[PDB]
Amino acid sequence: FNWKLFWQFLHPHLLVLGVAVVLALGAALVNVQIPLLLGQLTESQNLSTHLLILYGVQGLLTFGYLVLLSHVGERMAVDMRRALFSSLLRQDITFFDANKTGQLVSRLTTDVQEFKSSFKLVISQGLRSCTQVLSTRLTLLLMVATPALMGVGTLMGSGLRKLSRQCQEQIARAMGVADEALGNVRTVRAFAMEQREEERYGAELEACRCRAEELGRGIALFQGLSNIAFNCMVLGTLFITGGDLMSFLVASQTVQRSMANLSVLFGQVVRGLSAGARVFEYMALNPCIPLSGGCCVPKEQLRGSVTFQNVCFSYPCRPGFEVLKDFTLTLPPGKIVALVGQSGGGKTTVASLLERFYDPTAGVVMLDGRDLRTLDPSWLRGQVVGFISQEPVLFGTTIMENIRFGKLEASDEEVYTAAREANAHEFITSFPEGYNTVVGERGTTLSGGQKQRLAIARALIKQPTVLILDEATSALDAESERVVQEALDRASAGRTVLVIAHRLSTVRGAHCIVVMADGRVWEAGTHEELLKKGGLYAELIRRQALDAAENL
Amino acid sequence: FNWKLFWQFLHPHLLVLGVAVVLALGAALVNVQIPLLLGQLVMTESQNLSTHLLILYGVQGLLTFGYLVLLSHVGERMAVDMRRALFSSLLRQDITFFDANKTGQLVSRLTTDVQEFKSSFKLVISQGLRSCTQVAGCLVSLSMLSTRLTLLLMVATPALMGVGTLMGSGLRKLSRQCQEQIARAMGVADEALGNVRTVRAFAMEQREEERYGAELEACRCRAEELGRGIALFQGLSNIAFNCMVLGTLFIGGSLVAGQQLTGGDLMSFLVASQTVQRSMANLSVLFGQVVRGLSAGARVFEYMALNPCIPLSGGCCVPKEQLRGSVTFQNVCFSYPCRPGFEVLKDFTLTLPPGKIVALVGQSGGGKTTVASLLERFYDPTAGVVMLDGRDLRTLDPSWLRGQVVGFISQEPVLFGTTIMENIRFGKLEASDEEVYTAAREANAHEFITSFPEGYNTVVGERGTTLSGGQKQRLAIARALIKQPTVLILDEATSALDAESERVVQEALDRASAGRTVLVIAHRLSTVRGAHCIVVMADGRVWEAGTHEELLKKGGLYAELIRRQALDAAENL
């Protein structure tokens, strides 16, 4: 896994890598003749011009060998970042709840560069140092191979890998304290608890040093023992022609100086290998639910009948705490089914199961008789179901491209037709640039009602058969709430709609209402049926009628 | 700024740093006697010398370990002092900065850039000290009084070229352009992975991979340009040194014939320069790290030196006996620093009586939340003044005001990743366990907190138990009540709350609003009906003002708002 995947990225760049080896051997080959011709120095002018040619040749051989190594290292990094980001996006929602967004961005950009630059330095110094280095040759090569093997034959006992893993654990822990403090700085200032956050970070900061000093003392232990191991190798080979033994002792002294350069970079070797291990860690991960694995149903066959049969669910984070318990509900095609209940009853959880973000622990969820497990998730989310959350998410691009997120192969004329259906075209045209206006952090800040109107137009381009509306008009102002709801009803026409609303006034004219308590269907039926039943709905609407009469 | 602040962190660790220099000079000193004593060796006579040589190896290894440990200790302790000073300076920066700079990039500059500099500083001294001791040992042993000056000059030449190019318009602009694209591609990943749920909902994953992939090839493009640039310096530096050898050979050679310098000195210098060439080559390899390290080190000291417009402790405190709670806005004009042209607040004049609850109503984007942020002194007005009991907020201690005088309640509450008891305790730092429960009972929070298995020891947030909108807001009320506020801001506290939860939270807020100056910015006009007076905002100015009955009799903006509310109420019946 560590070296099996590493070879896959190195293999295409290996041809370019070989050219740099030749250039490095040739560069130090010119360096051998440099003091040779210097010792020899009209006779002077012929030799001085000759020496100036050799400097430019060595300087060109060194530059090229360093440029090729920088090119191989950077191109290998892009292939790793491309493969990791693709594998990260494929990962299920359970993983994104367990792992912070900040640490994932760091593993994708910092850890890759930490390995890349470390890989560059080991070959840059290694190749240069090794080029500076019949019977004496065999004994010399034997002494170079020993610290490369012995540094692994000793790594079997105490593990420098456990020290770096403990160091990376505290590095991410202190990183999360800074992200929570600086990210919610406005809330920190509000209650003027800055010195408390500095203390909370300061404590994690001294622990950050503590674990790094332990690894630091560990890396220094290897470097020190490696110096003793080499000097003992000299004494070992001395006891294991007389002119060869005499020459070898001077030759080992030259290797000792060259091996010392690699022993200095051992700290980078640890840091770099630990870095790349984390890059290949999340790259190999396979999610529970795939993205392309399934079957598609044509628009001529798809009617839009959603059926939940004895669906029991519990989140993978809390396997004990049951969210949905024996939940049975069937949505008729074209009919608008309302969903009412207490906060924490599993309302938003029901919706996420239909979008197939998670699969039930018991029972099945079916779309027109076909189970969602056998269906293609990308097809279901991207062409069948249209989701609308209580808080809309707008990317850092233009308004025209932000709506175009619904259907990839959608024309410019398709966006304006979709925007007119969600009463968005009226206020978008009013802007100076209009549809070419950027939105988000860098772009123009938009009101709650304006943002939600854009989200409706986004979900309408893909022409959905099923529509989920989870508290679409939650934190909207009285005026904006009336506008957005009016456009939502127009989009609800001729579609299967699962309305999860807080305002009971909009769910009064639905196909049927589903009251939910402790993840179970508590009450079900039409508006009149649930009033005649005298249940939870009747008590809820009784309190609603008293509040309404008081406002008149 | 780059070196002026750098010396402040290096100065206390300089004493420990000097000890490591001595250990490195001693370790290479033993390495000189290693082939000297090994050459003497080439049964009892051998046993006495072999045991003696084994002692020398253990002494060399101990001097190598200690020198590396001291350098790791100095480097790590210096990093903590830098991270402590940067985080403190980052939190002090005004809100304008946090809107201009992303939270992710600030975390990276605080952790990654510090470690990028620290490990780079570690490597330059690790190789540099080891390599320089190999040169110092050869210099004292071979060179005479005249050959020493020529040797030291040849070492100082690439160092003069080294620093000079790093300060220039070449390498410095290439790394700045590389860091610009590094942060740009980082923002694409953060927007994609951060909003992954929305990306999946519309199944546009291949579009996000393409958007990142384009920024990823540009990330290589700018880094390859810097890579080709750093390699150009390394190559030219190799030519520069070999030309220096040719230069001193002709300069010194002219003095050799004139009996000024012996032939043995010139011959020794050429062997000495060849030893330095091998030592300088080790530092030339690390030049890529020198660029990377200095660029990252500059970014850390850039935001550390920054001074905000509004301080945190600079001001005066008003005693509880003098503090009544009278807020006054006198011809207050405000335009955000981001949009200096777009005027949000124009000639705002409002006075809040002490103990009285003043309601604030207006259209979405009329500058309602903007008024609230000016009272919390997040920003200062472009014209006019905001006064607390006759005293201007500019002369007042900001931390005293936010931490003891004003109690803010936002439409979306923010709960940290700690226990419930510690999350409420965010109000008053020196608050007892008994103070939290008394505050929780005042916000109807104690009733549902005790119901939990662990209770107050239950963690909340991402790792903790997820709480309902109404439950989260009830905790925020109890948090703001510990500091015992004189002024209270309620900005749409019951916005995204369910009909049932909305009635509970308001029932608590109303009791908390008793005997305090309250600025209620509510969307539901039904709760603002029983206030001291209602204010109406139009295009950033006070359009209509007066009591509930007064504004109805006036027949203005409030009358048209209460008319649309009456039509919505009849539809709910």
Ligand SMILES: CC(C)CCC[C@@H](C)[C@H]1CC[C@H]2[C@@H]3CC=C4C[C@@H](OC(=O)CCC(=O)O)CC[C@]4(C)[C@H]3CC[C@]12C
């Ligand atoms: C942490 C503090 C104390 C150091 C901050 C100053 C740096 C900007 C200096 C210190 C040592 C300098 C280095 C000392 C030696 C060299 C070798 C020199 O290359 C050669 O002479 C090699 C020639 C060859 O290839 O034969 C190129 C500049 C460089 C890397 C210098 C670049 C600038 C450095 C890193």
Ligand SMILES: Nc1ncnc2c1ncn2[C@@H]1O[C@H](COP(=O)(O)OP(=O)(O)O)[C@@H](O)[C@H]1O
């Ligand atoms: N990501 C999650 N991880 C763990 N528990 C969750 C998660 N999302 C929701 N829950 C839990 O599931 C239950 C119902 O959630 P949800 O459907 O979001 O609420 P609501 O009925 O208000 O829409 C609650 O007990 C909540 O804590």
Ligand SMILES: Nc1ncnc2c1ncn2[C@@H]1O[C@H](COP(=O)(O)OP(=O)(O)O)[C@@H](O)[C@H]1O
């Ligand atoms: N951080 C900000 N940067 C730039 N403009 C802002 C910012 N916050 C608010 N505004 C602008 O100020 C105006 C009023 O804002 P605000 O008080 O938040 O609205 P509301 O009246 O709905 O509460 C709007 O035009 C809005 O775009």
Ligand SMILES: [Mg+2]
């Ligand atoms: Mg919900």
Ligand SMILES: [Mg+2]
């Ligand atoms: Mg507001």
